[PDB]
């Protein structure tokens, strides 16, 4: 009982589900269809429970890569957008929203690390990563550092990695070739020696955690910091005066950072299918669908190119976008948790000096693609099998 | 102890294997040797335990599914049978004893799930699955039921789910490119809901097992049930007057039941090679020498296409052959064990309603990728501890090297 | 120690360290770079340890059977022979040091199976398998036994096995299809059966190690054994007049024992990369190179040719290069661990007669293949996920396996 001639939502309650139930309610007046918004707790872990029985939303709204989760378990179903809608948003986005070849969601809002600078004391931020050893010494003179971001955390550090050649899986046709694992070509490798490098120079440090990163940039002791939107919301707070740009260019190539996508995509037991694509092809996809959940909360750069042509003018957006356009979407498949496992433990030994770059990188894709289906089919099996065992007999004995 | 120079035979015992006796007479005439016959009991393990070692009868009857774990230890030996010889059997018998590209065994008699319905209700049986819901209601006013069969299995409702398109492995060039399954396209989809739409529209029941339904088409509270020839000479003793034909077709492609091919194959330690291929080849695989068999225990359907058309008079014969024809034959690998367990729980959430279609139906290939994985390394992992602990420490380097 | 600026070498505890010592102190005047050789305890399990480091030797040498591991967990760096320098070595060395396509090291000696006989009880050897069984009769008369080697071992009994067609893996141009595990085809079989029937036709014992061997050959038991240049200095002490040459062949086919080769690798994390080739390239391996360790303790066959066709004049060391040039590159992957215990169990099956050629030929590739996953992966995440998550001898691991009823 999911629903019967009306359409129930699902999104995360930090979203701007208030402009989503304006929308709803501008659907509502042109068709008739009672359009309930909901944002339960931990919806994304909770939803694919239900939904596996053919119960809860109608649409749900989550950033991709926890998607091809329920893609999978089959409680998406595909959707069908003819080709003048297809254009309509961006080229790059859609295959962030593709599961065996087909397109699984709409696609909403982007999600890209930007490169974010203090006009202050550096009014003009650097094009390259080969002057920050250059300016670090400069800003050293007036107890500054010209860099400061959290290395602890792999998905930091990988804009740098996979700027010059390296990559997580091999994207191939709609279709990760998942035996072409790319932490290991020169680009990867010259790419983890040049950061290690700087914190052997003594132009960085290496226990720069998150909470350390973002609180050096909002006191004006850093002149720059690598950081997503989500930070804007406290430069604000700290009157600092900031500047967001593209980020530096690695070897002369340009810097590949990991790209999420808010989407939403239609339950597979869900009977009102048509009403469900109806409402998010012109209803929410159209100017207005966004600039009404915008002005609840800001959604940053949108998948729309019409409405992301209007939201441009501020720089922020500006940037992100464009640092979006050069990077890597984030895989939505399984294997990708032990990716960021393997990288992770690669990228603390490499900087700590347990292991020479070259060694710990090729280390990580032993131990990562390895890794990656060992405790998989282990634990899926273990999980599944006694589970089928305990409550077969359970059933019988109720 | 080394199998004799004569040709010992196995067979299980429900088989006419006091028919081969019979054809054991013709055979110690011409060649003269004693052909004798042994019957042992649950011999489907007890075969890689003698002819593993040497040992074991030159020649085993069996079901070719089994044949697979047979072939690939090493056991049986590949055959040649003239060009000319294998045009006198079935094409598609043939594909069922085959091991990566090599005939490993000779096909005796086939055998493939069929429609059975009960003439004095149903005089004109549908073709259509579609009609089902139909045929319910108008036989329900009369205190009946369309159909009955068992759904605690995947052996009977799987001929529905194939019926648009649903495979288990894919069969290539004479092999199984085992990283492809098919429970889980739009024909396996499609088959599924229809199965779960009768059961929740009350056309059908869940819980019916095989029990309830054989005895309820006996009683004669249903007029239709989908069951093979084992159940044949109990409706014989029902005294129902009964048809049988070919299965019913869903989305106007024919439904596919699993097929499965009773083979015999001479094994590698049997250096009576030749006398094994000859008395099997011509003797037995004469329009006469399944006679012989078939006048004992009835063999069903035969892989032999003269002696067939002589009992396909019978249409019980006719329809199984007919719906062998368009089924799935039976892949003998290792993997086969698991798609059944996963299937099993697929098909049983779909129809208790705990989960939905292509929720619990994408778990299959889930648990078919993460079951098959884990015995393809517990065998390996008894081994290690009867290889590596018993061959290395228990026996003779304990027993003679202490 | 990392150097920096110099060069520290590692080799092993009983090979010409002197002999190249002596190149260290001559590269050492030329250039202006003192050369250290150290011969550490264990190195083979040391060098894994301080090189994923940044520390340890420059260069190493080690047989190119464990490099595997080492250009695997990316220690090793590669190198660069260019095509003339190519040339200068017996072109099925260079197959011995590749890895994903990419040479790792530079080979120097050779070592593989030969077919050692006693001169006086048998002045000509038999050139075939098939004439074993004769020749057993013909001796067996005089008190003696024609052949006699170590059957307890995979390393000795693979030459036949793999005389007709049978291989561990597969090698067509610079990799390994791992999913191609040939032992199984009729090679193998025919092999197997051979040997298996010598047993059985009573021409040979069943219960035969590598002690038992050695001593009836030094004792003049036996007219024959295989094995390779590390037993001569024993027979060198026992005075028996012995004579080396190629193994006897199966079915036409010549026989096939695995070549190994020992190998100079150059540290990734050296920073005087350049001085390691230059002193490997233009010294320790012209000539004099060799001609020095050879001096101090003699190497074999080498992988040099213009050395080697010296050293060969000594009938023994072109007898191993005779037999090397027909045998088998041993595999240096990881699963070559699992393999070796597949067809130890094998063979000690069908040499007991448990089971048949057919059955312990097919039962071995499927161990194998479930044995290259069920260790090399499981003791490899169970060590990961010990470590990264944590806050000679199998010892299998957990967890629970439940299966029916
Ligand atoms: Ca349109
Ligand atoms: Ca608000
Ligand atoms: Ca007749
Ligand atoms: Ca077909
Ligand atoms: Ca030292
Ligand atoms: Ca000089
Ligand atoms: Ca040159
Ligand atoms: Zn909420
Ligand atoms: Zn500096
Ligand atoms: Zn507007
Ligand atoms: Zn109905
Ligand atoms: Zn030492
Ligand atoms: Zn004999």
Known sequence: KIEEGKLVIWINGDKGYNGLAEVGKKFEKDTGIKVTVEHPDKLEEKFPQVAATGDGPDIIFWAHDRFGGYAQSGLLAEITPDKAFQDKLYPFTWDAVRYNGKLIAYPIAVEALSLIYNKDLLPNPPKTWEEIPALDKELKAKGKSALMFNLQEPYFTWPLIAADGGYAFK????????????????????????????????????????????????????????????????????????????????????????????????????????????????????????????????????????????????????????????????????????????????????????????????????????????????????????????????????
């Open 171 to 398: 994207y191939e046709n709609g279709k990760y070739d998942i035996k072409d694992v790319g932490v290991d070509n020169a680009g990867a490798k010259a790419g983890l020696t040049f950061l290690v490098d700087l914190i052997k120079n003594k132009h960085m440090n290496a226990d720069t955690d998150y909470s350390i990163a973002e609180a050096a940039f909002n006191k004006g002791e850093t002149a720059m910091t690598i950081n997503g939107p989500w930070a804007w919301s406290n430069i604000d707070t700290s009157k600092v005066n900031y500047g967001v740009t593209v980020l530096p260019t690695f070897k002369g190539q340009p810097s590949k950072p990991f790209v999420g996508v808010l989407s939403a995509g239609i339950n597979a037991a869900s009977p009102n299918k048509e009403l469900a694509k109806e409402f998010l092809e012109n209803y929410l996809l159209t100017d207005e669908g966004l600039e009404a959940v915008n002005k609840d909360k800001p959604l940053g750069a949108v998948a729309l190119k019409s409405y992301e042509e209007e939201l441009a003018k501020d720089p922020r957006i500006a940037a992100t976008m464009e640092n979006a356009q050069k990077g890597e979407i984030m895989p939505n498949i399984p294997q990708m948790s032990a990716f960021w496992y393997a990288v992770r433990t690669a990228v603390i030994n490499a900087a700590s000096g347990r292991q020479t770059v070259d060694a710990a990188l090729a280390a990580a894709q032993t131990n990562a693609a390895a890794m990656a289906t060992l405790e998989k089919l282990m634990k899926a099996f273990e999980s599944l099998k006694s589970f089928q065992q305990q409550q077969q007999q359970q059933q019988q004995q109720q």
